[PDB]
Enzyme design. Structure first.
Site, PDB file in Angstrom:
ATOM      1  N   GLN A  93      -3.855-106.340  31.002  1.00  0.00           N
ATOM      2  CA  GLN A  93      -2.493-105.831  30.924  1.00  0.00           C
ATOM      3  C   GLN A  93      -2.097-104.911  32.090  1.00  0.00           C
ATOM      4  O   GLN A  93      -0.918-104.671  32.302  1.00  0.00           O
ATOM      5  CB  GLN A  93      -2.274-105.102  29.599  1.00  0.00           C
TER       6      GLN A  93
ATOM      7  N   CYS B 164       0.333-103.614  25.458  1.00  0.00           N
ATOM      8  CA  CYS B 164      -0.696-104.156  24.571  1.00  0.00           C
ATOM      9  C   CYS B 164      -0.046-104.962  23.433  1.00  0.00           C
ATOM     10  O   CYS B 164      -0.579-105.988  22.977  1.00  0.00           O
ATOM     11  CB  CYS B 164      -1.586-103.025  24.017  1.00  0.00           C
TER      12      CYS B 164
ATOM     13  N   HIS C  73      -3.111 -98.714  19.929  1.00  0.00           N
ATOM     14  CA  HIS C  73      -3.458 -99.853  20.763  1.00  0.00           C
ATOM     15  C   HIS C  73      -3.491-101.128  19.961  1.00  0.00           C
ATOM     16  O   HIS C  73      -4.194-101.234  18.947  1.00  0.00           O
ATOM     17  CB  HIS C  73      -4.792 -99.594  21.485  1.00  0.00           C
TER      18      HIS C  73
ATOM     19  N   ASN D 210      -9.482-107.957  23.271  1.00  0.00           N
ATOM     20  CA  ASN D 210      -8.726-106.874  23.899  1.00  0.00           C
ATOM     21  C   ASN D 210      -7.969-107.444  25.111  1.00  0.00           C
ATOM     22  O   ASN D 210      -8.089-108.631  25.390  1.00  0.00           O
ATOM     23  CB  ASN D 210      -9.697-105.762  24.312  1.00  0.00           C
TER      24      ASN D 210
HETATM   25  C1  LIG Z   1      -0.618-100.217  23.717  1.00  0.00           C
HETATM   26  C2  LIG Z   1      -1.348-100.304  25.054  1.00  0.00           C
HETATM   27  O1  LIG Z   1      -0.654-100.864  26.133  1.00  0.00           O
HETATM   28  O2  LIG Z   1      -2.457 -99.899  25.177  1.00  0.00           O
HETATM   29  C3  LIG Z   1       0.827 -99.728  23.883  1.00  0.00           C
HETATM   30  O3  LIG Z   1       0.886 -98.474  24.508  1.00  0.00           O
HETATM   31  C4  LIG Z   1       1.659 -99.748  22.610  1.00  0.00           C
HETATM   32  O4  LIG Z   1       2.660-100.360  22.541  1.00  0.00           O
HETATM   33  N1  LIG Z   1       1.284 -98.923  21.487  1.00  0.00           N
HETATM   34  C5  LIG Z   1       2.099 -99.004  20.292  1.00  0.00           C
HETATM   35  C6  LIG Z   1       1.272 -98.525  19.105  1.00  0.00           C
HETATM   36  C7  LIG Z   1       0.430 -99.573  18.412  1.00  0.00           C
HETATM   37  C8  LIG Z   1       1.168-100.909  18.316  1.00  0.00           C
HETATM   38  C9  LIG Z   1      -0.030 -99.010  17.066  1.00  0.00           C
HETATM   39  C10 LIG Z   1       3.309 -98.072  20.399  1.00  0.00           C
HETATM   40  O5  LIG Z   1       3.090 -96.949  20.691  1.00  0.00           O
HETATM   41  N2  LIG Z   1       4.501 -98.374  19.614  1.00  0.00           N
HETATM   42  C11 LIG Z   1       5.575 -97.374  19.575  1.00  0.00           C
HETATM   43  C12 LIG Z   1       6.561 -97.398  20.762  1.00  0.00           C
HETATM   44  C13 LIG Z   1       7.883 -96.594  20.658  1.00  0.00           C
HETATM   45  C14 LIG Z   1       9.134 -97.411  20.315  1.00  0.00           C
HETATM   46  N3  LIG Z   1      10.342 -97.244  21.125  1.00  0.00           N
HETATM   47  C15 LIG Z   1      11.326 -98.314  21.062  1.00  0.00           C
HETATM   48  N4  LIG Z   1      12.514 -98.168  21.602  1.00  0.00           N
HETATM   49  N5  LIG Z   1      11.159 -99.243  20.134  1.00  0.00           N
END
Ligand SMILES: *[C@@H](C(=O)O)[C@H](O)C(=O)N[C@@H](CC(C)C)C(=O)NCCCCNC(N)=[NH2+]
Ligand SMILES: [Ca+2]
Length: 215
Positions: A19, A25, A162, A182
């Site tokens: 990525q 992710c 993640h 992953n």
């Molecule tokens: C994961 C990665 O690239 O390692 C990446 O940071 C990610 O998207 N993490 C997610 C959490 C998991 C799916 C539990 C994330 O943090 N989701 C929340 C994002 C905030 C939402 N903002 C908008 N506008 N929807």
């Protein structure tokens, strides 16, 4: 459900991607699950494009993060998702450039796994195929993982950060596990994979945010 399953062995899983530094992710996790369903329904194994999701899934925040359910909802509403060839990953946010001509899969909804339930997760994996899940990937021990069944007591089930792909489950050295794909490249872990402790009180929160697309 069978004692073990490994979808890599059935050819339902595309090669491990990287990525980069983009917080996408969730996009790799989503296309992984859609790729599984695509193979199961058509017999074709094909790379679907996480860039399509990054730029176009407006309920999410591109490289600033997102959820897999939102991604499946996008593909349903949009009536398709492009292949990686038709919409290549560049690891940064761009304007939406979806082209239906490059459409490689569809989605008619999604289903959530009952929160915290590792048995429902196992059955979903057994019945459906690879399932999108989220974990706490913040520990030094996870990041430098190389082999074996991963377990660290400091892992926090309430701190999901993640998104990955559960492509199977099994048991090694009497230790039950999930086979987790992953998106940190093939050098990380065991060829880009990790076996994560299964049935150990929802370790790392692996069953707290799981879902799969309907196709
Ligand atoms: C994961 C990665 O690239 O390692 C990446 O940071 C990610 O998207 N993490 C997610 C959490 C998991 C799916 C539990 C994330 O943090 N989701 C929340 C994002 C905030 C939402 N903002 C908008 N506008 N929807
Ligand atoms: Ca949503």
């Amino acid at each position: 459900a069978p004692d073990s399953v490994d979808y890599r062995e059935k050819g339902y899983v595309t090669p491990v991607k990287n990525q980069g530094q983009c917080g996408s992710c969730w996009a790799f996790s989503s296309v992984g699950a859609l790729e599984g369903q695509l193979k199961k329904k058509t017999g074709k194994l094909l790379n679907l494009s996480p860039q399509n999701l990054v730029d176009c899934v407006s309920e999410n925040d591109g490289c600033g993060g997102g959820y897999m359910t939102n991604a499946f909802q996008y593909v349903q509403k949009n009536r398709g998702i492009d292949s990686e060839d038709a919409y290549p990953y560049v690891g940064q946010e761009e304007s939406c450039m979806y082209n239906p001509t490059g459409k490689a899969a569809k989605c008619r909804g999604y289903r959530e796994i009952p929160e915290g339930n590792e048995k429902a997760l196992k059955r979903a994996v057994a019945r459906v195929g690879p399932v999108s899940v989220a974990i706490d990937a913040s520990l030094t021990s996870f990041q430098f993982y190389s082999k074996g069944v991963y377990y660290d007591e400091s892992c926090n089930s309430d701190n999901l950060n993640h998104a990955v792909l559960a492509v199977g489950y099994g048991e090694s050295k009497g230790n039950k596990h999930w086979i987790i794909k992953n998106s940190w490249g093939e050098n990380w872990g065991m060829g880009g994979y990790i076996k994560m402790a299964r049935n150990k009180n929802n370790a790392c929160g692996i069953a707290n945010l799981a879902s799969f697309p309907k196709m």
